[PDB]
């Protein structure tokens, strides 16, 4: 019934998105109307959205700066 630890998990999820989902996974036992489970739902939503966005950004950067440049091939304009 403590609101502090799901909030801590929500904040910490900004540096590792899998933490937010773990937050909802761990305290599902608590009753739904409790503030702890509501903040756990918020943690899961934040973790999921940040997971999608972080995967997008990481993959885009990885492509544009590694996979765009195969070592052996040659590149000219706009490369």
């Amino acid at each position: 019934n403590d609101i502090t630890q799901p909030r801590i998990h929500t904040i910490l999820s900004f540096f590792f998105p899998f933490i937010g989902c773990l937050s909802y996974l761990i305290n599902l036992k608590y009753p739904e109307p409790s503030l702890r489970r509501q903040y756990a739902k918020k943690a899961l939503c934040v973790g999921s959205a940040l997971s999608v966005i972080y995967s997008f950004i990481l993959c885009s950067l990885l492509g544009q700066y590694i996979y765009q440049y195969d070592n052996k091939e040659i590149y000219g304009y706009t490369y």
Partner: protein, 985 residues
């Protein structure tokens, strides 16, 4: 229980898993095992989740209330049919693609027939609903868990399925609809020639108890006609003070008010109390809450007595007063549903007086008294004499005159008025007796069954003194629950043992009978007594013919004067009429009725072991409203499976449609062999399985009950939901693939891409007129988005003369160029410098200066490092562009099928119900994250054959999926809303 390993092994026997294992033969045949293994991975994951949920249902069921469910076997059959149809269609499409010499711009080193066969196998594995048994198991187990959470313990898994389709509820009034805490409300005193009476009848008068809160003993008796709410609330005020209600109004229950009327009321209450030796008032040991022990029906008499005295809490001397009246245990008549009265015998401490009411009879001394309590309808008819008030001195039994017909009607219409207002009435009678009368009663060979001597006598010794009316308060939520049932079009029938006017009154109070039904006689049209269920209108006749009973009782809503064994007839009639009967009972004699009912319901704590062993579910809540929530959850359990099957069909038909269109239109296949297996795993399993935990819709408790014969897919889910999503998804994915290939390689169809690569023919040496084929140059047009330049660029492949090997050159020239001439000024200076010195040795330079081998270059070593030639399997710019385009199409397909999960959930527009489920958020983001990561992880991309995209490429791939969210904001769910969700046009 079934062994866990046996449960895990058994789930592979479902038809869809069997079909997937049939497709897994590719791992043993001459095919790619690295892609056929993933089918086993999907099957193993589904089996693991399903066996976990089945094992958990084995815990939530059985131990908490004490092989396939018909829905499960029907849905397994449906999944098998879907798999067979998909396999047949894909077989036709793949045979068409093989008869035509179809081939891909990539996969040049492999045989096209094997590639297209493996792609068809992957499409078959996707289109077969391999997750259907797993989702049905999860939905049923989670539904049972939800039922247990809502105080409804289901004993059998099939009970969860059958509850949603239930169309009638039969519940006992007492215990289920109304709480068993009966409290006294009025009491009527009967004495002719009395000085005080109601409406100047001079024979009867009514009295009212206050306060009337549950089983609380303190209070008194007052006059009904004078106690308004204003005078009642001031009596409630200062109730903590000692007994002083006389300051407000005359309290007839105060023993200090020794008057004739008070004497009669005391006599009636003392006669009532002596019949209640089986019950006693009590208080909780940890809370100042009153209570009652013993029979529930006898309870309110003791509480009523405590308000006029005759209780240990009022005076400790009451124990000796009761001890003065010894009891004759030999003649006691026990109460049961067949007799409907109970008789007790006691000895008096006097000669011919009882609570100042005189039983004087010449030549007889009445040392004993017989007290009777029971239903008025079985004691009033045999009444012989009443009490009479003589002058203003004493009340004596009127031995002088028998009860006339008008005198009987005096009691009759008062009983009629008191039985209304939802009050049940108990009539108390007496018979004076002597020692010789007790000896005669003991000499009777008959048991306590008849004891006819008490009721009938040649001297007419049978006196009813009055009535006691008690209210049976309805449970707090029963009215809302019945209103919800009416909105759900599930018929609600009350079965009760109370009298017929009482039954109709309590039904009207709790809302079974509306005031709008007064246009017809609700007294007889809906509420009937059980005596009417026989051809002759009396219980002696056994039964009434079925062909008339089924037609007579189809309008009836309330049954009165019922018996536990009669419930069987009601269940049979309703079952013959076509309803799915859920009947409630305690199990003493109605266990066969519960068993014969479609959904037996044990009455929780009050129910016996037989009821809990015969019923399909147990109401631990001890409340009727739980059955309504039970029907709601049962309906949600089928609705979630319906949504899941809609998702499956609407995505896995669109897959086949766009594959067929790609093959027909000579486009590259929109998905790889294992890309489609990854798509299947990332749109079923997650988030399609997350549809199993959807909360109830706003109209799932408003639609009529689903008939059992109704198919899972009504035509409403075909004209909208399935077909308009398959067509839209095919359009979106095909347009994404076409625009993707146009952006990435400059052409959108296989003919354009293949003609885009230049080939040369070399005549064989050992075989005359036989020609080998090679490629010596490739072009491509790729759209570019960058800070420096936005627009088309051209990329080429050629045999590099400086490095003497095939190389890939990107961005040779800005804008599309028909024939790239490296000696021109348009070409990038590096490419011009790399070949301006001329071709390397023995090579040709006539056609634009590219390095093509001369016509005499043939050797039997096909693709064996021949100079001037790109090797087979080398990734030309055409092949790389096609791979990038197929990656964008794959991501678009995943985000098009996954986003359907957000519009399947409810017919309401998705923006209102977005946050309604969290498991769908988890599964949707898992799918999205694994889609983005599968195209950038170096290990995964080497087997999925995907290449990592640019940021604007990812936005372009996703946007073709968000265009499929116009399935909600435009058409056709708006059409469905306007045609069915609109309350009125």
């Amino acid at each position: 229980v079934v062994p866990v390993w046996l449960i895990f092994l058994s789930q592979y026997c479902s038809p869809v898993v069997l079909l997937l294992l049939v497709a897994a033969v590719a791992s043993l045949a001459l095919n790619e095992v690295v892609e056929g293994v993933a089918i086993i991975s999907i099957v193993t994951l589904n089996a693991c989740l399903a066996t976990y949920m089945e094992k958990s249902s084995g815990d939530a069921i059985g131990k908490l209330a004490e092989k396939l469910t018909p829905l499960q076997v029907a849905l397994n059959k449906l999944g098998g049919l879907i798999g067979l149809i998909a396999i047949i269609v894909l077989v036709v499409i793949i045979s068409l693609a093989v008869i035509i010499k179809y081939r891909d711009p990539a996969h040049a080193d492999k045989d096209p027939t094997f590639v297209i066969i493996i792609i068809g196998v992957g499409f078959a594995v996707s289109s077969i609903p391999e997750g259907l048994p797993m989702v049905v198991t999860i939905t049923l187990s989670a539904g049972a868990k939800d039922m247990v959470k809502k105080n409804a313990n289901v004993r059998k898994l099939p009970a969860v399925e059958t509850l949603g389709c239930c169309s009638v509820i039969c519940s006992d009034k007492t215990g289920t609809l109304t709480e068993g805490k009966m409290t006294a409300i009025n009491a009527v005193t009967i004495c002719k020639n009395s000085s005080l009476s109601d409406e100047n009848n001079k024979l009867t008068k009514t009295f009212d108890f206050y306060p009337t809160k549950g089983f609380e003993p303190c209070g008194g008796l007052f006059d009904s006609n004078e106690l308004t709410s204003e005078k009642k609330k001031e009596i409630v005020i200062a109730k903590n003070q000692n007994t002083s209600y006389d300051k407000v109004l005359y309290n007839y229950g105060n023993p200090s008010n020794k008057s004739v009327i008070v004497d009669k009321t005391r006599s009636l209450m003392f006669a009532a109390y002596l019949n209640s030796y089986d019950t006693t008032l009590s208080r909780d040991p940890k809370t100042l809450k009153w209570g009652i022990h013993g029979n529930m029906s006898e309870g309110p008499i003791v509480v009523a007595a405590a308000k006029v005295g005759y209780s240990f809490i009022n005076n400790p001397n009451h124990k000796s007063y009761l001890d003065n009246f010894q009891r004759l245990d030999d003649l006691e008549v026990t109460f049961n549903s067949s007799r409907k009265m109970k008789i007790t015998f006691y000895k008096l401490k006097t000669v011919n007086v009882f609570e100042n009411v005189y039983l004087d009879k010449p030549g007889k001394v009445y040392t004993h008294v017989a007290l009777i309590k029971g239903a008025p309808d079985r004691l009033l008819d045999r009444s012989t004499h009443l009490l009479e008030e003589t002058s203003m001195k004493k009340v004596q039994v009127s031995w002088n005159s028998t009860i006339t017909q008008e005198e009987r009607n005096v009691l009759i219409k008062k009983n009629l008025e008191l039985s209304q207002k939802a009050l049940r009435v108990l009539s108390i009678c007496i018979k004076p007796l002597t020692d010789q009368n007790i000896e005669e009663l003991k000499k009777l060979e008959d048991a306590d069954e008849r004891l006819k001597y008490v009721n009938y006598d040649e001297n007419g010794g049978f006196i009813p003194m009055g009535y006691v009316a008690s209210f049976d308060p309805p449970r707090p939520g029963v009215k809302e629950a019945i209103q919800t049932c009416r909105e759900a079009q599930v018929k609600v029938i009350m079965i009760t043992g109370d009298q017929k006017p009482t039954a109709v009154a309590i039904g009207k109070l709790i809302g079974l009978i509306e005031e709008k039904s007064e246009q017809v006689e609700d007294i007889n049209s809906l509420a009937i007594e059980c005596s009417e269920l026989h051809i002759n209108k009396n219980p002696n006749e056994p039964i009434l013919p079925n062909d008339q009973l089924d037609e007579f009782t189809d309008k009836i809503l309330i049954y009165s004067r019922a018996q536990p064994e009669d419930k069987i007839t009601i269940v049979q009639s309703l079952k013959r009429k076509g309803y799915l009967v859920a009947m409630t009972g305690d199990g003493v004699n109605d266990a066969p009725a519960l068993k014969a009912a479609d959904i037996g319901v044990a009455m929780g704590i009050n129910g016996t072991e037989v009821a809990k062993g015969a019923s399909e579910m147990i109401l631990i809540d001890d409340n009727f409203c739980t059955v309504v929530s039970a029907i709601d959850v049962g309906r949600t359990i089928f609705s979630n499976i319906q949504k899941f099957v809609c998702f499956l069909l609407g995505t896995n038909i669109g897959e086949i449609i766009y594959l067929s269109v790609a093959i027909v239109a000579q486009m590259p296949f929109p998905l790889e062999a294992l890309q489609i297996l990854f798509l299947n795993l990332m749109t079923d399993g997650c988030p399609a399985v997350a549809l199993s935990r959807e909360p109830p819709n706003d109209d799932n408790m408003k639609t009529p009950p689903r008939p059992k014969k109704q198919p899972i897919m009504t035509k409403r889910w075909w004209f909208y939901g399935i077909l308009p999503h398959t067509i839209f998804e095919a359009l979106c994915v095909l347009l994404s693939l076409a625009f993707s290939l146009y952006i990435c390689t400059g052409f959108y169809n296989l003919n354009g891409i293949h003609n885009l690569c230049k080939t040369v023919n070399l005549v064989d040496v050992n075989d005359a007129n036989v020609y080998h084929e090679y490629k010596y140059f490739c072009s491509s047009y790729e759209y570019r988005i960058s800070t420096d330049y936005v627009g088309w660029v051209t990329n080429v492949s050629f045999w590099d003369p400086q490095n003497n090997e095939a190389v890939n050159f990107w961005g040779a020239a800005k804008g599309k160029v028909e024939n790239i001439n490296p000696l021109s000024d348009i070409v990038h200076p590096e490419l011009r410098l790399r070949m301006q010195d001329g071709c390397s040795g023995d090579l040709t330079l006539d056609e634009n200066g590219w390095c093509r081998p001369k016509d005499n270059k043939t050797s039997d070593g096909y693709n064996d490092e021949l100079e001037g030639i790109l090797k087979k399997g080398f990734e030309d710019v055409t092949a790389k562009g096609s791979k990038r385009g197929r990656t964008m199409a794959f991501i678009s397909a995943v985000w098009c099928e996954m986003l359907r999960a957000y519009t399947v959930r409810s017919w309401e527009p998705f923006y209102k119900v977005f946050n309604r489920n969290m498991w769908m958020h988890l599964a949707c983001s898992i799918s999205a994250t694994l889609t983005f990561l599968s195209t950038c992880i170096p290990g995964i991309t080497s087997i999925l054959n995907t290449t990592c995209l640019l940021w604007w490429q990812y936005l372009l791939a996703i946007f073709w999926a968000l265009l499929n969210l116009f399935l909600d904001e435009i058409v056709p769910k708006v059409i469905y809303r306007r045609k069915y969700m609109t309350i009125k046009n």
